[PDB]
Design an enzyme around this catalytic site. Structure first.
Site, PDB file in Angstrom:
ATOM      1  CD  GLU A  40      -1.474   2.469   1.256  1.00 22.18           C
ATOM      2  OE1 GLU A  40      -0.502   2.736   2.004  1.00 22.18           O
ATOM      3  OE2 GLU A  40      -2.061   3.348   0.575  1.00 22.18           O
TER       4      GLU A  40
ATOM      5  CB  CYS B  61      -4.410   2.847   5.566  1.00 25.11           C
ATOM      6  SG  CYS B  61      -3.825   1.511   4.515  1.00 25.11           S
TER       7      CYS B  61
ATOM      8  CB  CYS C 287      -4.711  -1.476   7.973  1.00 22.80           C
ATOM      9  SG  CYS C 287      -4.097   0.153   8.073  1.00 22.80           S
TER      10      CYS C 287
ATOM     11  CG  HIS D 115      -5.663   4.442  11.032  1.00 22.75           C
ATOM     12  ND1 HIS D 115      -4.564   4.866  11.741  1.00 22.75           N
ATOM     13  CD2 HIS D 115      -5.189   3.725   9.982  1.00 22.75           C
ATOM     14  CE1 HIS D 115      -3.466   4.446  11.134  1.00 22.75           C
ATOM     15  NE2 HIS D 115      -3.820   3.746  10.067  1.00 22.75           N
TER      16      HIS D 115
ATOM     17  NE  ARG E  75      -0.119  -3.722   6.168  1.00 23.69           N
ATOM     18  CZ  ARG E  75      -1.328  -4.282   6.043  1.00 23.69           C
ATOM     19  NH1 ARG E  75      -2.209  -4.255   7.050  1.00 23.69           N
ATOM     20  NH2 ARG E  75      -1.658  -4.893   4.904  1.00 23.69           N
TER      21      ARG E  75
ATOM     22  CB  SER F 131       3.928   1.134   7.861  1.00 25.91           C
ATOM     23  OG  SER F 131       3.354  -0.104   7.445  1.00 25.91           O
TER      24      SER F 131
ATOM     25  CB  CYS G 247       0.411   0.411   5.111  1.00 23.22           C
ATOM     26  SG  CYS G 247      -0.437  -1.119   4.808  1.00 23.22           S
TER      27      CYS G 247
ATOM     28  CB  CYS H  55      -0.416   2.939   7.461  1.00 25.12           C
ATOM     29  SG  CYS H  55      -2.004   2.226   7.836  1.00 25.12           S
TER      30      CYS H  55
HETATM   31  N1  FCO Z   1      -2.085  -2.720   9.840  1.00 25.47           N
HETATM   32  C1  FCO Z   1      -2.013  -1.663   9.433  1.00 25.47           C
HETATM   33 FE1  FCO Z   1      -1.914   0.112   8.757  1.00 25.47          FE
HETATM   34  C2  FCO Z   1      -0.008   0.144   8.909  1.00 25.47           C
HETATM   35  N2  FCO Z   1       1.128   0.168   8.989  1.00 25.47           N
HETATM   36  C3  FCO Z   1      -2.168   0.665  10.413  1.00 25.47           C
HETATM   37  O1  FCO Z   1      -2.328   1.016  11.493  1.00 25.47           O
HETATM   38 NI    NI Z   2      -2.590   0.530   5.917  1.00 27.71          NI
END
Ligand code: FCO
Ligand code: NI
Ligand SMILES: *S(=O)(=O)N1CCOCC1
Ligand code: SF4
Ligand code: SF4
Ligand code: F3S
Ligand SMILES: [Mg+2]
Ligand SMILES: [S]
Lengths: 545, 263
Positions: free
Chosen positions: A21, A68, A71, A75, A472, A495, A539, A542
């Site tokens: 991503e 994102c 995922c 969030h 992640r 990430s 990501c 992210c």
């Molecule tokens: N899993 C996921 Fe996205 C990332 N890095 C988030 O929080």
């Molecule tokens: Ni993500």
């Protein structure tokens, strides 16, 4: 049997990193066919933290969810936990259950798509599948996985015929210029294994629809769920019998695919690439935990997460330290932010963008560099797996030991790119093993109690933190409320921990460290860089937000 | 046999990838059938095998194809600092999108971000993010929502390939999917008409499925087909007890907030 490695000495840049991503540029320096230095350069900034300033804290989750869409949900969950903490509301038991089930559904969808659709093309030569004997492939499939019609010679031949027609069409589409075209020494699998994996790649495209449907029964829709509110959840229908029956049915189908296809394919690939248990390791791991039985406070989340929280340093599995939320900070020294922003705890976070130039090794990423007590931390399935295994969490002990026995490797072999990949599968199997228990708990609770949102009041001034372990890794959102509005809102995302740049002392992030020592069989087709980078499941939307 | 499926080039700019994820939730057809049988998906960063220079080469091969191509754009265009805050292969996103748009047979903006600018454009717009038409002055077929239903995106793609440009409203959205208000098809409409509203999320009225208008529902001002087609064959936000955010409307991050009020 030696790992293929050229004599190449020089730079390699990979931009775009595809099958992640977001927008990542990796630069490495290579000497005699092995990477000797590395840079993780995130190439897009959006600035959600800046956008949130002055807004209604109730609105935060809707903005931050759009950090994102891979995922998705996570969030919105972290923001909801963050504002819940800032307003000092304890969500009802049903809301804890529903939020944690939606997370479980997300882990299943996300990890299945990652293994097949993002990662598998680094290990599987799809064109070699056309050379396989489908009866030999069916026989192999029957030896390594439960009996299933999709593994029949007839089914595998139908996949081969579809792929042959596509390849011979002259329009290779998503396979255009694939690193495996024409043969590549770093691709080890027998054609039969390529065919089984390819058949499952196609099946997984259908199965992920079902995993997203399960998630949406509770979440409202996928992508971008819409069932969380300050104080709990809105989805009264999600507590009821028929929806939960459908959720269980879909989840059982997805889990059957995890157990019949994902795990056996993962173990088959791992068996051929055992050398990759010695490539891509790091040393320090962080998790905030997930699937807690008490989410009334961030500290209770850390303490009661069924996938436990903790900190491991220096690969020492004999000690797991408690997470100290006060010890988290982010540096910007090597990032595209204004000078003066190093060492900030997220409650004091500053997001002051300042671009320089492409490949400026002094400032080379839109990610900040999160650090913990001065160290970089790897987060995600491997972090959770080591923490849980070290603590003797019984599901992790069972499933990890299964993998260690199948591959004839020690737990230490998991400090690697192969290990990171394996841990993602291990935890997917464990989520599956818990779905029936978690669904029953919520079904029984929802039958006797329809409290789903607690009462609350917006404070004039407060602060709060929301923790989650997303697919992640360790995710935290941090709010300062002043005048009943957002004064500061900081995201520190998994990430960011894994793929951010160097910190204030010039210390490499986990992906940068992991890339040191990568062998390169062909510098024009550096699949080995992709294997490690993809194993962290990056990501960048992210990571930067 | 000389064969050709229509070429699609899909660019990712300032995006969250939720639109790519939405697209792959299609079931009529599934995404494998679409890309094996109906289109030639020739560049798509999220799923393509090539990376780095090989991926950039695949892009250039597609852009220079003698049969032409359709352009799908996901994400807004970050324009500040000469476009340098959003780059792929060392090129500003606005530059690559401008080049691809100039020769495209048609342009489909998947999502509110590419259609209208989206979340990164929300005030104070740190990156000076713009929608594609906003930035380039080109007409686009907009499939907004955050993300749009795959039914609307795949339906639009199939329509463009087999029938032509669908009739578009003044915001560039196909009337086939965006011709009606969310509210007009909402199963809570009889409650709205009877002024039967949930005053809070914990209320007995919320448990009874009363209308969510007092809690900020933007269904009455949002054009989309959510209650009619559902998401994931199972649900939509109001069925899950939550107000509509107005996510298929231009600039909704600023025009529909605060989300839990009627501003
Ligand atoms: N899993 C996921 Fe996205 C990332 N890095 C988030 O929080
Ligand atoms: Ni993500
Ligand atoms: S609201 O402003 O009361 N709402 C009522 C009906 O339709 C649009 C707006
Ligand atoms: S429209 Fe929404 S879901 Fe699509 S890229 Fe933009 S933020 Fe993501
Ligand atoms: S819940 Fe929203 S869309 Fe449904 S009737 Fe009420 S205002 Fe309209
Ligand atoms: S928030 Fe968006 S997905 Fe439909 S219900 Fe409202 S237009
Ligand atoms: Mg941040
Ligand atoms: S083409």
């Amino acid at each position: 049997k030696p790992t293929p490695q050229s004599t190449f000495t020089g730079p390699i840049v990979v931009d775009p990193i595809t099958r992640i991503e977001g927008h990542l540029r990796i630069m490495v320096e290579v000497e005699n066919g092995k990477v000797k230095d590395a840079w993780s350069s995130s190439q897009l900034f959006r600035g959600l933290e800046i956008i949130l300033k002055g807004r209604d804290p109730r609105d935060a989750q809707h903005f931050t969810q759009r950090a994102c869409g891979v995922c998705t949900y996570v969030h919105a969950l972290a923001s909801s936990r963050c504002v819940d903490d800032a307003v000092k509301v304890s969500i009802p038991a049903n809301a804890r259950m529903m939020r944690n089930l939606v997370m479980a559904s997300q882990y299943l969808h996300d990890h299945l798509v990652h293994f097949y659709h993002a990662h598998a093309l680094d290990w599987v030569d799809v064109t070699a599948a056309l050379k396989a004997d489908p009866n030999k492939a069916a026989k192999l499939a029957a030896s390594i996985a439960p009996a299933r019609p999709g593994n029949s010679a007839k089914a595998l031949k139908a996949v081969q015929d579809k792929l042959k027609a596509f390849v011979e069409s002259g329009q290779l589409g998503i396979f255009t210029n694939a690193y495996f075209l024409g043969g590549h020494k770093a691709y080890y699998l027998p054609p039969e294994v390529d065919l089984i994996a390819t058949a499952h790649y196609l099946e997984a495209l259908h199965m992920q629809v079902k995993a997203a449907s399960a998630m949406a029964i509770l979440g409202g829709k996928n992508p971008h769920t819409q069932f969380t509110v300050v104080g709990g959840c809105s989805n009264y229908q999600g507590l009821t019998k028929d929806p939960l029956a459908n959720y269980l049915a879909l989840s059982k189908e997805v889990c059957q695919f995890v157990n019949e296809c994902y795990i056996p394919d993962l173990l088959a690939v791992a068996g051929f690439y055992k050398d990759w248990g010695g490539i891509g390791g790091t040393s320090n791991y962080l998790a905030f935990g997930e699937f807690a039985t008490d989410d009334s406070s961030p500290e209770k989340h850390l303490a009661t997460s069924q996938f436990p929280s903790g900190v491991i340093t220096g690969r020492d599995l004999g000690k797991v330290d408690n997470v100290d939320l006060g010890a988290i900070y982010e540096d910007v020294k090597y990032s595209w932010y204004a000078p003066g922003g190093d060492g900030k705890h997220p409650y004091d976070g500053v997001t002051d963008p300042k671009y320089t130039k492409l490949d400026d090794k002094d400032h080379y990423s839109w990610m900040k560099a999160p650090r913990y007590k001065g160290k970089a931390m790897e987060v995600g399935p491997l972090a959770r797996t080591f923490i849980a295994y070290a603590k003797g969490q019984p599901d992790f002990k069972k499933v990890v030991d299964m993998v260690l026995g199948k591959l004839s490797v020690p737990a230490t072999a998991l400090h690697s790119t192969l290990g990171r990949t394996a841990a993602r599968g291990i935890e997917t199997a464990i989520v599956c093993a818990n779905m029936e228990k978690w669904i029953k708990e919520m079904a029984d609770s929802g039958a006797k109690d329809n409290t789903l949102c607690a009462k609350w009041e917006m404070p004039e001034e407060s602060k709060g933190v929301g923790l989650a372990d997303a697919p992640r890794g360790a995710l935290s959102h941090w709010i300062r409320i002043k005048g009943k509005k957002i004064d500061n809102f900081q995201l520190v995302v998994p990430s960011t921990w894994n793929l951010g740049p160097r910190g204030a002392q010039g210390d490499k992030s986990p992906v940068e460290e992991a890339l040191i020592g990568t062998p390169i069989a062909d510098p024009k087709r550096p699949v080995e860089i992709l294997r490690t980078v993809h194993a962290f499941d990056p990501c960048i939307a992210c990571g930067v937000h | 046999t000389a064969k050709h499926r229509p070429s699609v080039v899909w660019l990712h700019n300032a995006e969250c990838t939720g639109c790519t994820e939405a697209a792959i939730r299609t079931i009529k057809p599934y995404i494998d059938a679409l890309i094996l049988d109906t289109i030639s998906l020739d560049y798509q960063e999220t799923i393509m095998a090539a990376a780095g220079e090989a991926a950039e080469a695949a892009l250039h091969q597609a852009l220079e194809g003698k049969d032409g191509y359709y352009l799908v754009v996901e994400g807004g265009l970050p324009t500040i600092d000469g476009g340098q805050w959003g780059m792929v292969a060392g090129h500003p996103m606005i530059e690559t999108t401008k080049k691809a748009a100039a020769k495209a047979k048609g342009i489909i903006c998947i999502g509110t971000c590419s259609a209208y600018g989206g979340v990164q454009k929300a005030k104070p717009n740190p990156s000076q993010a713009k929608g594609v038409s906003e930035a380039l002055g080109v007409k686009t077929i907009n499939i907004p929502g955050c993300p749009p239903n795959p039914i609307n995106f795949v339906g639009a793609v199939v329509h463009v390939l087999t029938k032509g440009i669908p009739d578009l409203d003044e915001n560039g959205r196909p009337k086939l999917f965006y011709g009606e208000l969310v509210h007009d098809n909402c199963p809570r409409l009889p409650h709205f008409e009877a002024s039967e509203f949930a005053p809070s999320f914990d209320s007995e009225e919320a448990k009874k499925g009363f209308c969510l208008y007092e809690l900020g529902c933007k269904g009455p001002v949002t054009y989309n087909n959510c209650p009619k087609v559902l998401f994931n064959q199972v649900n939509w936000p109001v069925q899950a007890g939550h107000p509509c955010l107005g996510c298929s409307e231009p600039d909704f991050w600023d025009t529909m907030t605060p989300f839990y009020e009627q501003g």
